[PDB]
Amino acid sequence: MLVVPAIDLFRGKVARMIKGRKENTIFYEKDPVELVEKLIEEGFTLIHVVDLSNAIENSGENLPVLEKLSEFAEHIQIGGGIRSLDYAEKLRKLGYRRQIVSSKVLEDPSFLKSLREIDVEPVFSLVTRGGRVAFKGWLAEEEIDPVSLLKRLKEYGLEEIVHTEIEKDGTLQEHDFSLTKKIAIEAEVKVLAAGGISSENSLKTAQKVHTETNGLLKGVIVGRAFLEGILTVEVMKRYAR
């Protein structure tokens, strides 16, 4: 199973937004480029970097950092603001081969293919609250089961997702691995789990579902608990076999 450390970037710096909330913004004093080097040397193969300035702002402030993070791209999976092919190409040029996409794929599901013509592995970001897909639309977010969405995206060549329980991370709450398992298993998509990856009980559960699903659960993304020291590098690596 993969244990994937998460760094969020906002206004140049390492940031967390509590449950995605913009002025619930907190900044860490860490060098995102050194932290990434450190994570590399400690032996981590995958790292989740989200550009919070592109996703929320449509800003380019973090590009300088990604230009320098691009030393370690074959190791980094990048998200935030990837809504046009032109931008995806820039990233791919730097070496960024796994890219988290979302809103664009629901605007135009052919975006997945365009991304395969440029050796990008499109990773679809699936946010859910209370087990309900966080569609902007009313009936859509009430009625469309996660499985139903990804089953249709599968037809457009989708393979890998990140399933984020947005309202959990930034807190004690544990990730609902029952959901994630159902998702991985019924949609037959590879899943990285995010949100409420809070403690050791979570990696334990994750490992067990990583098994229950023949690896359809790739692993978890640790953001909150990683940066703050709840889960240390020692404890994380113990759970990546």
UniProtKB/Swiss-Prot annotation:
- State the source organism's domain of life: Bacteria
Molecular function (GO) terms for this protein are: 1-(5-phosphoribosyl)-5-[(5-phosphoribosylamino)methylideneamino]imidazole-4-carboxamide isomerase activity
Catalytic residues, per the record, are D8 (proton acceptor), V127 (proton donor)
Q: Where in the cell is it found?
A: Cytoplasm
Q: What class of enzyme is it?
A: isomerase
Q: Which GO terms describe its biological process?
A: L-histidine biosynthetic process
Gene3D superfamilies annotated for this entry?
A: Aldolase class I (3.20.20.70)
Q: Does the keyword Transferase apply?
A: no
Concerning Pfam families, the annotation shows: His_biosynth
Q: What is the effect of changing D8N?
A: Loss of activity
Subunit organization: Monomer.
| HAMAP family linked | HisA
Give the protein's recorded name.
Answer: 1-(5-phosphoribosyl)-5-[(5-phosphoribosylamino)methylideneamino] imidazole-4-carboxamide isomerase
